[PDB]
Structure 1
């Protein structure tokens, strides 16, 4: 009300409204799902178009051979944060000959987003990210919020109507975690999960976007007729 003019102002109940408004931009964004087993980690994203003449906005971005994310909210902010991850992943390789741990990648994103929430002049990031990766401690899935909060999960979903997919994964927890050495079945579970967030529209060939990473599988994105198999 009087305490939402900038990011440097607490409300009387201890809330940061500019951060909460940035969080709102994520809810307006299109749905994206993340889930993993012990061997592989999968991203599934519902892409959004402007109209029938327009293309479908890309949702998934590659960060390294072993790491990448999906976005929901302001796309340009995701480009900034993914670029930062690309640099950090790359700094780890060039200096230490070491693939960046997914957990440490989350810590770096948290700290970058935090600086924007405590200083005058700037603004919080208006995007949520789901980071997947495979490192020395196996498969991983992270959820990033622009408040700074990063959380490691078995599965999750963000965006509009994301609660439906999140409930499904909460039921299926014991099943999909055990899908080891079977990428196609893990993707099936992700496609079935994101389907719980759909209304009116359904999954078409240029609508669906999938990405996967695993033990002997580099981070690769599937679009177009490559995802027709899973429709």
Structure 2
């Protein structure tokens, strides 16, 4: 079975599956956990940075695409670079040509369409990275979840990566609570860090190990790492 139908994305299995894509999704789960949640005034990204050795750095998992949009990655870093760069351009085109900030919902459609082209053609490979995009546009705060299959979904909160299911349950529970943490960012960030620790096990989030990003009403997408996140550990 499978072995005869997982040689490349241009092949359907007898049951209608695309293994190469499923295998790509697997690289995500193997990636360090990252979380995303939003009230009505802000959207937050809390990502657990992973380190190779104890002599190594904790690889950056958050990329800024514009002044009102950014994302967290889980999986192949190179692919996140490619996709976030594609997003940076689309956000840029919208501003230059139409003097308009690109809608988060729209950025999602673009990523989905870019991902799909790499699942129907021979020679290409699907992207092996998952992304969580937060942003504040003309319709408020937004959080999107992007899957290499090309599926993008808007949520109030979520998590992807290893053990992500921990935080995802926490959020699905804390929902009615954080959804109302309007006007107070520090509270939303704390709820974000609480959710992310629900997927811990190995260690405990440290100063050079934690990474947080925020965007909202009167807050341009900004990245906080190290000392700047100490007051949350």
TM-score with structure 2 setting the length? 0.99
C-alpha distance in 1, partners of 2:51/2:190? Answer: 24
| Offset of residue 221 of structure 1 | 0.2
Please list, as runs of the form range in 1=range in 2, the aligned pairs for 1:63-212 lying within 5 A after superposition.
63-212=65-214
What SS class does the counterpart of residue 171 from structure 1 fall into?
helix
The DSSP-based 3-state class of the residue aligned with 1:230 is: coil
CA distance in 2 between counterparts of 1:200 and 1:36 reads 27
Residues in 1 aligned to 2:34 and 2:202: alpha-carbon distance in whole angstroms: 17
SS of residue matched to 1:118: coil
Structure 1 residue runs without a partner (length 5+): none
Distance, in Å, in 2 between the alignment partners of 1:53 and 1:150 is 36
> Matched residue of 2:118: which SS?
helix
Quote how far apart the aligned CAs of 1:200 are. Answer: 2.7
Deviation at 1:11, TM superposition (A): 0.1
Distance 1:177 1:162 in 2: 20
Q: Could you tell me how far 1:44 is from its partner in structure 2?
A: 0.2
Structure 2 alignment gaps of length 5 or more = none
Q: 2: distance between equivalents of 1:24 and 1:203?
A: 24
Q: Distance in 2 between matches of 1:200 and 1:85?
A: 33
SS of the residue 2:220 aligns to: strand
Task: Give secondary structure in 2 for the equivalent of 1:161.
Answer: coil
1:29 matches 2:31: yes
**1:147 alignment partner, SS class:** coil
Q: Secondary structure at the match of 1:63?
A: strand
User: Hey, what's the Cα distance between the residues in 1 that align with 2:181 and 2:102?
Assistant: 25
> How many Å separate the matches in 2 of 1:125 and 1:52?
29
Q: In the TM superposition, what is the alpha-carbon distance from 1:224 to its structure 2 partner?
A: 1.0
Separation (CA, whole Å) in 1 of partners of 2:89 and 2:54: 36
1:49 and 1:173 map into 2 onto residues whose CA distance is 31
Q: Partner of 1:121: helix, strand, or coil?
A: coil
Q: 3-state SS of the aligned residue for 2:127?
A: coil
Kindly provide the CA deviation profile for residues 7-47 of structure 1, in whole angstroms up to 9, marking residues without a partner as x.
10000000000000000000000000000000000000000
SS in 2 for 1:109: helix
Distance 1:151 1:57 in 2: 26
Superposed CA offset, 1:50-81 (max 9, x none):
00111110000000000000000000000000
The number of equivalent residue pairs is 231
Cα distance in 2, alignment partners of residues 7 and 23 from structure 1 = 13
Between the aligned partners of 1:141 and 1:96, the Cα distance in structure 2 is 24
SS in 2 for 1:93: helix
Moved over 6 A (4+): none
Tell me the TM-score normalized by structure 1. 1.00
Query: Aligned equivalents of 2:124 and 2:57: distance in 1?
Result: 32
